[PDB]
Amino acid sequence: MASLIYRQLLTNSYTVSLWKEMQYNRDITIRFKFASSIVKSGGLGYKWSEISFKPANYQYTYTRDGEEVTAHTTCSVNGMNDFNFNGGSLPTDFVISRYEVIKENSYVYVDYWDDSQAFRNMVYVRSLAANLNSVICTGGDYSFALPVGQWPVMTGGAVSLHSAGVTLSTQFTDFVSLNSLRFRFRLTVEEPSFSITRTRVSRLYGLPAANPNNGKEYYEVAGRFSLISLVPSNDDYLERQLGELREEFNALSQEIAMSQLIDLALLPLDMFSMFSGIKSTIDAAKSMATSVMKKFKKSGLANSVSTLTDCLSDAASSISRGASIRSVGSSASCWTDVSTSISTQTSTISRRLRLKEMATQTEGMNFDDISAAVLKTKIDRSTQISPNTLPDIVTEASEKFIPNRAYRVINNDEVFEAGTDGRFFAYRVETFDEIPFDVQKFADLVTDSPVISAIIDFKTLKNLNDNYGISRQQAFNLLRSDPRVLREFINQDNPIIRNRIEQLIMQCRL
Amino acid sequence: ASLIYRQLLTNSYTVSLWKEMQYNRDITIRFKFASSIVKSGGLGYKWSEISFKPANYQYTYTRDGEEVTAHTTCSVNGMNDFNFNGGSLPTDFVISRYEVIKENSYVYVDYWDDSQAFRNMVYVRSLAANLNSVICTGGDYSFALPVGQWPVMTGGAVSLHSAGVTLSTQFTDFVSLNSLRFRFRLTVEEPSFSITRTRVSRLYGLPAANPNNGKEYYEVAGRFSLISLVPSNDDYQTLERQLGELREEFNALSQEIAMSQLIDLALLPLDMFSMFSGIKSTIDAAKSMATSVMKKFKKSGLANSVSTLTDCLSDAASSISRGASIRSVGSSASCWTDVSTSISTQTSTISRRLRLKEMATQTEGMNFDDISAAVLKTKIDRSTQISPNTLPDIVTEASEKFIPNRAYRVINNDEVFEAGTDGRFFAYRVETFDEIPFDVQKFADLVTDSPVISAIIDFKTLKNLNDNYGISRQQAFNLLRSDPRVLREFINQDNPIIRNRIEQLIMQCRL
Amino acid sequence: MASLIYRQLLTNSYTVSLWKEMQYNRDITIRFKFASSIVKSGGLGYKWSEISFKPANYQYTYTRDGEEVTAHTTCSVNGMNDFNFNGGSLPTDFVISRYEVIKENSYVYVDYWDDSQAFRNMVYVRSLAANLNSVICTGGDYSFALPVGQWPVMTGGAVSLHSAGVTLSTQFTDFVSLNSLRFRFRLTVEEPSFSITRTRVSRLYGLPAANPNNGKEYYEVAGRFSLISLVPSNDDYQLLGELREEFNALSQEIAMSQLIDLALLPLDMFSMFSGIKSTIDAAKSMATSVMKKFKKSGLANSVSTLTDCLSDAASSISRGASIRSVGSSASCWTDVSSISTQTSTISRRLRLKEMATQTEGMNFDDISAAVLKTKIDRSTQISPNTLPDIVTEASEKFIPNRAYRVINNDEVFEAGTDGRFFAYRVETFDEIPFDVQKFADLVTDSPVISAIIDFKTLKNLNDNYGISRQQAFNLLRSDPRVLREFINQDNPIIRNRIEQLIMQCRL
Ligand SMILES: *[C@@H]1O[C@H](CO)[C@@H](O)[C@H](O)[C@H]1NC(C)=O
């Protein structure tokens, strides 16, 4: 459990979240404006080349419900009809070679954009739809300034714009390029017609392309849109000296309670519990489990685990082991090997039981459990545990917490111990009395059978059985490293155990 | 079946969308050049420039049974600027500058279609195409001079060979297209271009006056294979009354649920996949349901209480203020024996913390939340109104409001101590069930460390059964330990004192 | 454990990453240039209609710290003031209707772009910052080409460019479109003023809009930028016929003692994909690649279908699916010589009991996964597109026939997918009629065990290599300790069975 957090870091290292589907629902005030292109031919001044529409950019600033919002609109037309009027071939007759008009068969496009969060990084959009209201575009009065004679005026023209389909588009300009929202509008001819006064043309529906605004600042229409777009999870599109952080640990040296520590080290403190409560203040939250894992699977522990896996696989499959490497006792196995007297051999064989402890081949208190409990106590009670600094501190912890530990194995009422400090014992279960430590049997048992972690190691167990005379059940449970009886003793206030626990603390400090 | 709860809590850190798709498609690029003439003033013998322009062409051509709308845009770069002046007079034929295509120059062609490969193509890798080489021959452009003979530029042939491919963007006044950029190199051929009635001929290249030769387009076939990045949901181009209805559906299917098969299902490690693959129809290409449910799951009473238990063991182990403050019954306070709010009160307050022993792996028996999850799975699989959009926060409301009033027990040397959130507490013996005074300050020290077991077989029904349907020692031990073997044995032997308890639990998981 | 890896694959199926937040910090040499637009009115040539600025593109190639980098810089100005100077209403007096001048109120924009990686796919950016140094920009000598008269020369003018905020922009052209970075610069007038000679204008500050480059090839200013952008993790965005034979060549070369030592380890995803000397792309996407095919197979579909049938057997009861049930009642764990047929059919779901964590012994799929991890670290032919569906063909075709047992009151009931059943007592091996309709009621709920030590070899062993009570109980329970102890005692009646298991783990 408390070592299952390490096993989980390992397992989920492959993951070493970023996007989010955000829904947006906001009201808008589309204020657009037509624009006309007027090219007058030379000569006397009686001949006009074209009278057409021009896409017109228009940036404005209106008031939302307690916010001031800048916006930017661009109106355009498609499918307009090209009419013309030629009354004579002489330089003194009024002629307009080709002018554009809008009718049913045409459509009116309006690109819209704001500075809001919806259009900040909008490149992908689905579930798009909008409810727009209909308006009325009325043309104005443009006086064709002829040199001499009369002055025809194109006056009138009304047309109702009704909502239509919506899409995306891009407003291109010489400064900014904007991924914008394209509203379509259909046209219904109204009663006011446009007619050129003092001319033989009148009673023709449409809108004139000389003064469509009719001296207005804009044409206003309000709307609402609802869509779902893609945006990065992070809505935005010195820390310490490690010596001094070690001194912060030395300030949190020793004062973990023992009942509380043993109760804390019996909880599956999974990723959520382990990275939620720690220091209760961070904005980013950008997968800090991944941020610590990317440094966790770069260290000696992880490389040694992978080396164990590869020596097992290779040597099993076909590979011979170098003359320095030797098989002690039974058939070859990384678990049973003298890397390279008996003290040395047993320490070397114990250096892999640390990996057994974090390969789910344990039976008891699983020392890495207590190491992780201490870690979760320290990074909780502390404050300089910044997400940049927790990576490689979890690894310094996992690699420098409780280096000198000890293990044991049980076989038919006969226990065989071992430790990385070069110590090796063999002792009976019922009546503790040492035995000649049996090599070629300790290896054969520890290779396969479940191993136990010697928090109650044979020295302390002897001292305890001697002074605090022990019952059979208590002895069996201490051998099996049972937290129930361990905490019953810690509440019985047994100094022979409190000393061992304070020594574990002084060894798990750093 | 609480493995779903455990894995949700564990993988809540992850809180998929995009997808790598391969597209291998044929194309018929029907492209076209366009020339830009500018004729100087004076008489009409003087030409300012004769150059190229980016030339767009949109059309609609037939695929193998599909009508595909397409869009091409051709252009040339690195062309050579030749000139030719017959003199300095207003009447002499002069072309101050004209562009010609040679080997050193390159031809660019942007291509786009209305198929699926191009709708949201913004990132691409493994890009490659198999294009064939073509030939391009010059046209016949008759320079209109005011008076006299009529020179005509005629000839020129250059072969276009396929080359590297990349991306580009075809801008217009109406649309903007994320397009594919085919590049082409040039190699001279035998037909050379020359102006009739003029002292120039037998020089290689392709003129820029009229490349199309009057052809409506030049056509070249190809195929392209690539790998692009796109959103999963292909839709990026082109609750009180409902929850009450679902409550009613649960409170009408609860009794239609069975007991034997439910106990059979409650021994299954139903992982995320096992729970979210067997949806009724996998309705339409749903999102990551684990993330969808978790982003609601980790805001609730359950998860916040887990975090509180965590932090109250943490601070308590860090400094002695919290342990000393929680005011336990006595003889330890790690965090668990805390009374926020007599015996009844303490026991209920402690059992509301024992609610986490189930999803803390501190159990040994039937693990009641397993039954809750199983009933949830059964109902959301046999229901019709359950949507993937409303299942988030329903997987949380169920976990939070299933079996609010529940009971737990602890065994210690042939002495069994029960307790419940409803404020009940019974102490008794294992073999000969006989009530006994309940021992506070011992029940707490035992439930802290010793494994805790669920009260599906609680003392009341246990004693009714021991009287009517009197039981043997091994079966009684296994009922205490809540074994599925003996439980299913009784459920197949049709014991109504267990069937009624199970139906009660069902009426409590009704929601 | 070695089956827990399959259960974990199934669990993490929801993850079936691609993007990443990368930090780029690179040095750059901003070599920009101004450009002016001199428009001359008609008449004689003394009257100037306008002298404005123009967006000035410049494309070049410069040397970074061991790199040769191609770059592109676009200079522009904004908020420049418009001054005028008229010497008379005649066509023969030197007049400039409008000329643009620079002061504090104005700003200078510079769009910058390179061919490096930082600019290849820059579409999203955050935490943008930059360190730029200030420079001085001065105007040259633009001689107004008067047909006749004096020669006015606009000369002088200097301005100090101080850094300002940075943003994004897009440089558009008739050839290329570049997602570029917009460096903005504020201006402070310097001591040298701009003045037109042989003309009544002097001792006025700013930068002349006529010749701001001063005849230079560029204005060089160094800089550095830092950002955090989104990028595809795959850093490139901008053919079984012989595999089976390799497996069957590697099958028996593998040993047995060390294989059993390795088949007890929870070789989770890290441990399973660490010893693979993968490619730069496989190490990034291996797990999801194999998972997207692992949840497409008969194994996954059968698991999901058992789950669907358990849900439907708990719900349907009022209309309960009455297909068949031998035993107490419908379970969907027992859904069906007739006896041999039923047993094989039940064993095709005891494989799911195996990969559902409801076993006690060596859990044959675990041995299969151990063989897999021992073969795919040796096989030379392993590749990113290749391991996916090899993991699945392995999981599907390793040990097709496999047997199981259930113990009840010292009476073992066996079963096998090969249509064989054996009932027998633990202490005294002697067969018994196989009790169907009880074997099912027991295998349904009681734990099951695997047939690594199956009855045939078990009896051969109890005959030849006389066996003790505890050793026999542990061999029934399928204990790896006693298993490895026999394998080290060199018992051919177990070595042969293990070799058979290998040869079935063949692919
Ligand atoms: C066949 O395998 C054995 C061990 O399994 C090995 O010693 C031998 O060299 C192999 N044969 C060849 C030709 O390599």
Side-chain angles (χ1 to χ4, degrees), chain A residues 31-204:
Chain A
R31 299 176 182 175
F32 74 100
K33 189 209 293 182
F34 300 97
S36 296
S37 59
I38 37 163
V39 179
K40 191 176 181 180
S41 300
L44 299 175
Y46 289 83
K47 319 190 191 69
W48 272 268
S49 179
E50 55 181 355
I51 295 163
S52 55
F53 293 100
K54 257 284 179 179
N57 301 118
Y58 178 73
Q59 56 177 232
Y60 57 98
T61 54
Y62 65 103
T63 53
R64 214 163 276 192
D65 301 329
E67 187 174 3
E68 298 182 0
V69 46
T70 308
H72 187 288
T73 316
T74 302
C75 183
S76 178
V77 187
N78 185 275
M80 62 231 79
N81 303 329
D82 312 72
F83 294 170
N84 61 87
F85 165 75
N86 48 323
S89 60
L90 293 306
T92 333
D93 84 307
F94 167 77
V95 60
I96 33 164
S97 306
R98 181 257 288 178
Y99 71 106
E100 294 179 344
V101 71
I102 321 187
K103 299 192 174 186
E104 57 189 352
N105 67 330
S106 315
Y107 303 98
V108 169
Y109 297 133
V110 180
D111 302 323
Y112 184 71
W113 194 83
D114 298 329
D115 68 328
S116 304
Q117 186 63 239
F119 313 101
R120 256 186 174 81
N121 302 120
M122 190 178 70
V123 188
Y124 300 91
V125 169
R126 59 169 181 78
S127 182
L128 184 59
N131 305 126
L132 282 159
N133 73 280
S134 62
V135 304
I136 293 157
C137 290
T138 67
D141 308 67
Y142 178 81
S143 301
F144 298 92
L146 293 171
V148 64
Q150 294 177 343
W151 274 37
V153 280
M154 181 157 57
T155 68
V159 65
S160 271
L161 296 179
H162 292 273
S163 180
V166 62
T167 51
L168 294 89
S169 293
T170 308
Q171 298 183 35
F172 289 103
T173 48
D174 300 328
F175 309 139
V176 301
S177 57
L178 307 173
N179 292 268
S180 135
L181 210 59
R182 161 60 66 79
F183 300 113
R184 187 173 60 180
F185 292 89
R186 66 192 183 82
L187 299 114
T188 48
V189 303
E190 284 286 2
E191 157 167 8
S193 174
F194 72 100
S195 307
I196 316 190
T197 317
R198 316 185 192 179
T199 313
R200 290 191 71 264
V201 67
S202 53
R203 308 308 312 169
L204 59 164

Side-chain angles (χ1 to χ4, degrees), chain C residues 101-117:
Chain C
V101 70
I102 319 195
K103 289 194 175 184
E104 284 74 356
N105 70 96
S106 65
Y107 295 98
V108 171
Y109 301 150
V110 176
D111 313 7
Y112 184 81
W113 191 90
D114 303 333
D115 65 346
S116 304
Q117 190 66 22

Side-chain angles (χ1 to χ4, degrees), chain C residues 145-193:
Chain C
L146 292 175
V148 69
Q150 297 179 324
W151 283 80
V153 186
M154 198 171 199
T155 189
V159 73
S160 289
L161 310 184
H162 303 339
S163 181
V166 58
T167 343
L168 293 85
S169 278
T170 312
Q171 298 188 44
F172 300 100
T173 47
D174 197 70
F175 310 137
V176 298
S177 179
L178 276 50
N179 299 272
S180 150
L181 218 75
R182 163 59 64 80
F183 294 106
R184 198 251 296 283
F185 296 90
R186 64 186 182 80
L187 314 97
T188 58
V189 302
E190 248 289 1
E191 156 166 12
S193 129

Side-chain angles (χ1 to χ4, degrees), chain C residues 26-27 61-70 115-117:
Chain C
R26 303 182 182 281
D27 296 358
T61 308
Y62 74 100
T63 300
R64 218 179 273 181
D65 301 328
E67 269 65 284
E68 188 69 7
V69 45
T70 302
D115 65 346
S116 304
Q117 190 66 22

